Every structure is written in structure tokens, then in C-alpha cells.
Symmetry: C3
Subunit: 351 residues, 3 copies
């Protein structure tokens, strides 16, 4: 699709905000990454840029990229963005501030394209794993092993399953906003917005203050270029401060929700589950860390816990009423006993 | 280039194979890496892409690029290709479906060109190693220290020294293979291949044959999309099944065999072969794991194992006929007995 | 981009060199890295290429790039250069043989402009400080917690605040230097040179000489293809060797000196100091390892060492003569008590 929820698209407009670490003396780049979410366990990561790529703010094409340079957009191709995490990602779809991308897992996320007088890249921390939700935990994107139940992302961008605060935005600097009132620096709107203000010099800065500007300060770089977008409510980033005198309502959804089904997944290479006489001999040979653990079945209790991330023949003494064997977030298996070494006389010879 | 082994080279077609980690952790692309060979003690890896870069079907240049879009080639410049491991390689030569490339070490192999309807890249896990010939343990050799007789793959092409069976390529998915002959589903060849075609419906399915054809059962998913090669050979892969019945012989060399060369190689910063009375004290100053070991030259064996990556004066009690000392896979020392003490007089007023 | 201290620029020519490491099979790059000055506690790196970017031989601009192709320059744009570390840097300026780039933090340095079918980049290892003198260490100066002195390299190049010993353009490899004068081995200069010389055959077998060329043996490979430019004064690289005779030593500045700035710097998130009676409980939990040590003050010494990155309540027994608490190589804070632990309003001693 291109159009999935004009909830986000129409009612949001890009903005440019500071990147938390960029190492160009800490560049400002419109790819300022907040909310990395490798919270789908299926190879896929949702990333948030501070700019609203997707549809420009209109009806046409996920294949554009509209960030702010100035107070103005810069409506160019989607593919001029480069999300990456470890190895280069492959886009799945963009919607709003949010992109879904097939990426390697990563402790960080590292996005970047040339913009400004620099190379304008952006990086941020967020712990990602494509862990099974259970007694296993995994790294790399699926390419092996059995499927078993964990999170996975929606390819659907209409989701009202959660919503992120976007109600009354505020500033980011865009001193392209800030014109001059013929000696003193003058607040202006990006494309509409109730834009609040102050300078180092005295000015009113509580209430709506789009009709107030500072009449005592000349320097542009000591004043509050604002975007309270109250008709195109933008993502509320940490690198986008809020107003304090205004209130608008415009809480706006997130397109991509990690949902649980049969995620494309992993299963740590096949364990040998064999029952001998009241004993599960278990040759084990995993890849990703598997918590093997048990539930000795019957009147019995006897659990065992040991993370197995190393090949080990272990044993679990199966009782008459059974033992259970829980090779990670692979579903619990079960074993009864009375033996399984074969041959307890308890009959009458005649054969 | 060389056509002295047009056995593989000329008679090689672009081969299409599924990608297991790509754009949703899965995509359709020609490329998909089998038989990665970090088995050399060097720095170079022999790789098989599924795609047949090299020539086209002619004889000229390893610097063209023929991958599959359709069942047909796309014989273009090699400039859109990127062989990489976990970092960009430098090509050495391509011959057949096989590329030799001096690559940094890497857990994965990552190939990709955007020439498809999608991102059209491919990544897969495959084990690469380099280590010292005997003794020492390193992965990829340092940039300093001695050069010494590693295995390494050729600087050239069209060779032989070993051969892997490449006896009949067969069926791979691609519905360009299985077009429709205006009612019934129709097998096609890459450039000419003897196709032992059939479908689920009863037919002959063994023999050296392009006399096996089934049209009785119709659907591309109910029939065997084949390139049974025997004069257009590709290297055999897991994503390249063969016809169920008899092999069409086609055992084919590797033109990228391991040869001796002077690798940048392994030897951690210089040892000191010190001696006192019937003892090799050995002041050692390595920066890398060097398997030191010694051998007391008597009928005593005196084995040793000790990794030295720590600067240490160690000792080995030299027996009465010397000791030898084997400082990694850097050349053996040898040491006589008698005693020393480093030029100490033992008495010297002459009789 | 402008050039003012023609001390380095004019009195120089780029000197061809060979990269120390550039994969298993090295690329020859005349931008070979010596003298990394990345030991700034900021994340910024000054690199020395063996190439003399700057001028072409003109009067203006560091915006060009004169590296060596042959013995001759190749005077093109500097904008093809990419220093990078953990992500792309932004070049700041080149001056002399030295390029400065505002980088993300990184221990090592990796410089490169691609040329030819070879990588043509150059990288090197170099021990870097990311701490001031005294306590703690970082491998990446925090951007979390308080900022306190960080060395950093300039945002400029006009700067002569330190000086390295310099000589002159020594010898360089390349047979472009030595033609044959039809029976004699013939020096060819692209810059003018007083050439210190000898051949395999006897003549002046020191080559402590002014300008000479030994003709007793003739062929470039058995003769001294050296270009000692004595009308130029350049920095001594390791990938620049020099003649065996005269040096023209002359202390000549470095364009880049480590200075303090608004760098992300060397203190991780601030301690949470708690105080009970004569004892500091301290839950501590930064984002980066802080070498904590204390000095329970007075004639009591009490040093402590513990790397703090963990979320752990630790203790340092405040004496009655105070304590100091030394959160890294931050200057010690201090705290005395005899009663803390949330007070005892007296109606009785400690009521």
C-alpha cells in the first residue's frame, strides 16, 4: 500500500532535530533516531526517524522522503535514506516517522545519508534481539531452525494497536523560521503552527505566544524557533521539546506493532531426546542459548534449570509418572517412565 | 580469459537459488552462496556464487557478470557486483561459477547488486577460517612478523589439483524455466542442456535423457523446472537438486586450488633463545598466541604445550644431548647440551 | 579551505608510500598512515598521510589532494577522501602531509579515497588515549554524564602550537625516478633533488654525499632510486625513507595540536552519593566504566579501586576528618559526617 492511515500521514509533517551522536561535532540531521524497536523477533526492526518519510504529507508514494531542510520540506526519493543496523538493511515499508526494515539485530542502529555541509549520519542505542519469547534467546535474522512462538512485525501500517504521544508538539530549532521584525528576531510558523517563543531577552512565553515575539533581542541564535503542529501533529521526540502554555490533542498511532504468532524463528540445532531406563539421556548441541529445564511429572515436581549453549550430554531422571523436558521456547516435551532399557520379566515364558 | 578449462568455464550458465536472509529474511534472487572455503591458512577465500560471473557463454573476460533474471542471463559489467564477507573483498579471478577473492575474514558472506525488481542482494552464513600451518593459533595473520608456507588459493585461474563432483545440476525454481507451450507446461534450457524433464504424472525419470518429458500433469509447481547440465555445468548445491534418477557425469575440477605462497603470516614478536646450565630459559615477548613447545632431544619426549601471548621467561630443562624449541610455526630452534651460563668460565688456567 | 603556512605546503611534494595493511594482499597507497594523533580524549583524529594534500603547487586551498601517481603528483579534489572510524568522519582540513577530520570516537584510524579496481585506502593501528592523566579509561568518551576536559584536534589548520622534527623529502620507491641514460643509471627529478646515491657495484659505499649518481652498476633495481629534495622540508614518515647522506633537519610545526573543546568527554553519569553514619552507601550505575577510588581523608589514606559500570551499592567509610570520593579522573569531591542516616532531632542524644 501507499495509504494505510491518513491518521499519521496527513496529520504529521517532517521536522529536523538533533542527532544524539553523529561525530561531525554532533550534526543535526533529519534522521535523528528515536525509538529503535527490534521488538519483533523475526529479522525485522522498526526504526523511527525524526522526519516523516512515507507520503510527503499527502496521498502519493511511500517512495518519497520528506525531511525538513529549512522550515520547508525536501521531498526526494526513499532510497536516498539508508537504514542499517549492522549489515545494510532492506526497507520493507515506511509510514509516518516509522520505517519497517529487514535488518540484522543490533545493540545500536546506524542510519546515514549525505545532507548538509557534512555527511549527516545518525546513530542511537537500543537493545535488540530476535529472542524467542520463552526459555530461548536469539541473535541473527531467521535462516535456520524450526518456528516456535515469538514476536514478529506487521506489514500493516494502519495499526491502532498502540499510539505514541504526538499531542501538542513543540520546538526543534529551525532558525529559518526566525525572521527579523526589522531589528528584533521574529517567530514564524513552519506551514501553520501555534509557535511559542522567548529569547534570552524578556518576552511572554506562557499562553499562546504565536502572536507574541521578542521585541528586545536581535540575535536569532538565542531564541525559540517552534513548531507546535496542531494540525499536523508531529512525533514527540526527546530531541523535539514541547510547549508549556498551549494544549492540543492529536495523539497519533504507530503503524508497526510486534505481534505474536508463529514468528519466522530459530530452534537451536536438534537435541537428542531418548529415554533409557527411567532416564532421559540427552545429547544436546545448540547454537543460540537454550534454557533447558524440566518438570518432573506426577506427584513429583523436580525441575532442573541449566542454560545449554554448549554441546553437553546431560541427563534428567524420568520418574514413573514422567518428566518433562523443555528445550527452550520449543514447546515442553514429555517422557513417562517405567524403564525404556527394555526387558523386565513380569510374564509367563511360553515363547 | 583462459579457456584451457572451458570444461567448467565456457560451459557454465547463471544459476538461480533462494536467498535465506535478504529483505524479509528471504527474497528471490539468483545469488545465494554455497561452498565458501576459508580452509586456506591465508587470507583468501574461494566462494561459489550461484550466479555465474565470468564470461557470458563465450570465453572472454572474468570481468563480466551474468546472473539470472528469468532463466536467461543478464550479461553485464561486474561493477554492480559486490562480493563481500563482512567487509568488501578484492577480486582475484572468476572462473565458471566460482570466484576467488581476497576477503577479510567473516562469519557470513554478503553479495548483492540492485538489478532485480527488489533490493536483490543476498546474504547467508558460511564459515571462513585462516589459521597457522600447525603450532600457533590465529585467525587472520598479522601485518608483521615472518612470512611462512601457508595454504592460499591461486593468484591465477583455470587450474586443477582437486575436483569436486559437479555431476548433473538439475532442478531449481524459476518459472521462466517452466513456461507454457500454449497449453502445457514447457521445460527450457539455459543455453542448451539435456533436460530429463517430468511431472508428478507417470513418466520415465531415469536414463541419460532429454527423452524424459511430461506434459500430462500441468502446473509449474507440479513439474520439474530443470537445467540438467552436462554441457553448461554449474557447481552442485543444496538449492540445486538433481533429477531423482541416474547422474549425468560431470565431475569437474576447482580452478582455484590451494597452492603454497608467501602469506603475510604468523609469528608473534621475536623470541630470545637464552640458556643457562642445562636449561633453556626463554625470554619471550609475543603479542599473539604462539604455541611454544619444546622437545628434550634425549630419548625423553618432553612434550610441551603452552600458549605464549604473555611476555614470559619460561624454562625447559634441557637434557644431556640438547633440547629443541619450536616457537610457533616459525622455524624450529635446536640447542645442544653441555651447560652454559652465558659464557661463564668453568675453569681456564691451562695445564 | 585555504593554505597560509607555505612552510609545509610549498616546500613539499607528495611522497609515494605503501600502506601497512590493506587486506591480506596489500593495496599500494601513497596515503600510507604514519603518526596517528587520535589520542585526543574527544573522538577526533588527525592522521598523517604520506601524501601532501593541500596545494597542487599553487598558492591556495587545501581543497585539493596531491597524492603520488608515478613520481609525479595527481592534483585533484580532497573531497573523495573519507576518514571514518565507527562511522564516517567529516574532513576538517589538510595541511602539509596531515589531514584532520572530526570523527566519531575510535581507537584506530582508517583514511581512504578509492582509486583503481583496488581499494586504495589506508588504515593503521595506534594506541589512543580517551582519558586525561590520572584515573579511569574510556574507549569512547561518554556523551552521558558531565563534560570535563577532553583533548580534541582543531576545527582549523592554521596552528603551530607544537612542532615535530622534520627533514626533507627523502627517497621513495618507484622506477619513475630512475631511467637509464643509455649506459648510466639516470636520476630524474620532478621537484629538483640533491641525490644521495650508490649502486650494488663499488663507488661511494656509504652514500654520504651531496648529489651524485653511481654509474658503476646500472639498472634501477641495483641502484638507489632516491629523490632527496633539498629545496623542500617535509615530515618524516616511516613509509617515506631518506638518503644515506645529508639531512636538512629543521623543526617545523604540526598544523594540528590537541586542544580542549566542546567534545563529548571523559566522565560517565554522576555518582548517587548517599551518606549514613561514617559510611557512604553509593548506588552507582553509569553508562561507561568509571575507575572509582576514594581517599577517606585526613591522615587516613584508604585508596580504593573498582571499575564502576555495574548497578551496585558500594561503600567508602567516611572518617572524622572527611572523605573524598573520586569518580574517575574527575577532581575528588568530598563529604564528611558523623551522623547521616536521616537525622535524630535531640530530646536525648540521637533521639
Amino acid at each position: 500500500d501507499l495509504d494505510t492511515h491518513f491518521t499519521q500521514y496527513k496529520l504529521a509533517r517532517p521536522y529536523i532535530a538533533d542527532c544524539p551522536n553523529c561525530g561531525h561535532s554532533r550534526c543535526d540531521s533529519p534522521i535523528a533516531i528515536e525509538e529503535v524497536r527490534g521488538d519483533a523477533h523475526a529479522g525485522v526492526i522498526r526504526i523511527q526517524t525524526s522526519a516523516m518519510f512515507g507520503l510527503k504529507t499527502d496521498g502519493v508514494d511511500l517512495a518519497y522522503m520528506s525531511f525538513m531542510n529549512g522550515k520547508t520540506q525536501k521531498s526526494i526519493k526513499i532510497d536516498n535514506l539508508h537504514v542499517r543496523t549492522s549489515a545494510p538493511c532492506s526497507l520493507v515499508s515506511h509510514h509516518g516517522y516509522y520505517i519497517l526494515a529487514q535488518c540484522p539485530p543490533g545493540d545500536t542502529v546506524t542510519v546515514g545519508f549525505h545532507d548538509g555541509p557534512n555527511r549527516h549520519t545518525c546513530t542511537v542505542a537500543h537493545k535488540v534481539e530476535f529472542r524467542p519469547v520463552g526459555r530461548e534467546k536469539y541473535r541473527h535474522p531467521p535462516e535456520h531452525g524450526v518456528e516456535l512462538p515469538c514476536n514478529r512485525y506487521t506489514h500493516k501500517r494502519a495499526d491502532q494497536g498502540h499510539y505514541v504521544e504526538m499531542h501538542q508538539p513543540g520546538l526543534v530549532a529551525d532558525h529559518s523560521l526566525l525572521s527579523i521584525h526589522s531589528a528584533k528576531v521574529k517567530i514564524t510558523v513552519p506551514s501553520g503552527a501555534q509557535v511559542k517563543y522567548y529569547c534570552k531577552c524578556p518576552d511572554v512565553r506562557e499562553g499562546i505566544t504565536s502572536s507574541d515575539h521578542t521585541t528586545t533581542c536581535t540575535d536569532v541564535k538565542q531564541c525559540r524557533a517552534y513548531l507546535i503542529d496542531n494540525k499536523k501533529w508531529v512525533y514527540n521526540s526527546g530531541r523535539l521539546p514541547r510547549g508549556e502554555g498551549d494544549t492540543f490533542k492529536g495523539k497519533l498511532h504507530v503503524p508497526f506493532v510486534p505481534v505474536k504468532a508463529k514468528c519466522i524463528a530459530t530452534l537451536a540445532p536438534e537435541p537428542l531426546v531418548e529415554h533409557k531406563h527411567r532416564t532421559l539421556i540427552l545429547h544436546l548441541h545448540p547454537d543460540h542459548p537454550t534454557l533447558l529445564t524440566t518438570r518432573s511429572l506426577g506427584s513429583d515436581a523436580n525441575p532442573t534449570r541449566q542454560w545449554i549453549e554448549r554441546p553437553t550430554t546431560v541427563n534428567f531422571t524420568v520418574t514413573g509418572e514422567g518428566l518433562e523436558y523443555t528445550w527452550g521456547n520449543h514447546p515442553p516435551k514429555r517422557v513417562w517412565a517405567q524403564e525404556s532399557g527394555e526387558g523386565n520379566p513380569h510374564g509367563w515364558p511360553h515363547e
